[PDB]
């Protein structure tokens, strides 16, 4: 998830 | 090592011959490996059968603790 | 297996000689003796499947020797199956 990454 | 049964030219190991059979068991009563005693495979099989027959007739013990 | 005596009796009965062990009649007769003997064994030992593979080899071998004998000599075949008491 997170509504779509790596930071 | 070396095999005593080939040397003597024996036919059967014989379950009755306890004096012989006692040389091929441990203090615990266990059958000794052929790799230790240097017995030929053919005689090792006969020897196992002999020991197992002797253990049944209670001429040898199964174990050190009965 | 068939005993030395019982074997020899069949060799004499079916052979042209006492030493004629090879003949198709002797071979077929010997197989028939052992096939018939084993019927008692397999009646008792229905799940002796390993032994039965040996029985079915005898049955097969006998079929091959009879099919040989038949085309080689029809009369010798007809005599043999009569004596041994085979359908074919």
């Amino acid at each position: 998830x997170x509504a779509x990454x790596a930071g | 090592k070396f095999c005593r049964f080939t040397a003597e030219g024996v036919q059967e190991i014989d379950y009755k011959d306890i004096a012989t059979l006692k040389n091929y068991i441990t203090e615990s009563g266990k059958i000794v490996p052929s790799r230790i005693t240097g017995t030929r495979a053919k005689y090792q099989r006969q020897l196992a059968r002999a020991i197992k027959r002797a253990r049944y007739l209670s001429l040898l013990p199964y174990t050190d603790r009965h | 297996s068939l005993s030395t005596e019982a074997t020899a009796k069949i060799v004499s009965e079916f052979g042209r000689d006492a030493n004629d062990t090879g003949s198709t009649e002797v071979q077929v007769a010997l197989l028939t003796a052992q096939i018939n003997h084993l019927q008692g064994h397999f009646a008792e030992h229905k799940k002796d499947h390993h032994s039965r593979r040996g029985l079915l080899r005898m049955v097969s071998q006998r079929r091959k020797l009879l099919d040989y004998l038949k085309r080689k000599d029809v009369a010798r075949y007809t005599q043999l199956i009569e004596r041994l008491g085979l359908r074919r």
Binding site: - | D17, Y56, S58, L59, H66 | -
Partner: protein
């Protein structure tokens, strides 16, 4: 007729029957066109472990040449005889007259 090596060992209380049992068992063999090739009363030995809460028993060897039916009868005799605490009947390839390592 097949060759059998028969060991049986007896309750040490019934040691005095062992002569009688031997002659009875040999009669069963020899009264069927049988033979006794060897017969060795080993006597009372120390058991390697306790059988039947006993520390000794009276052993008897006898090699034999009997039919199967009497040896089967002999086994049932050993079975239903509270004297005979243990028995072993082995087939041998040939007759054995040579004396055992026990004697």
């Amino acid at each position: 007729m097949r060759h059998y090596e028969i060991v049986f060992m007896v309750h040490p209380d019934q040691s005095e029957q062992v002569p009688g049992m031997i002659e009875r068992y040999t009669a069963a063999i020899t009264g069927a066109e049988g033979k006794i090739h060897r017969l060795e009363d080993w006597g009372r030995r120390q058991l390697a472990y306790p059988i039947n809460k006993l520390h000794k028993a009276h052993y008897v060897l006898m090699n034999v040449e009997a039919p199967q039916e009497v040896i089967d009868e002999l086994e049932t005799t050993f079975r239903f005889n509270d004297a005979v605490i243990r028995s072993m009947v082995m087939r041998t390839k040939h007759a054995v007259t040579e004396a055992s390592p026990m004697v």
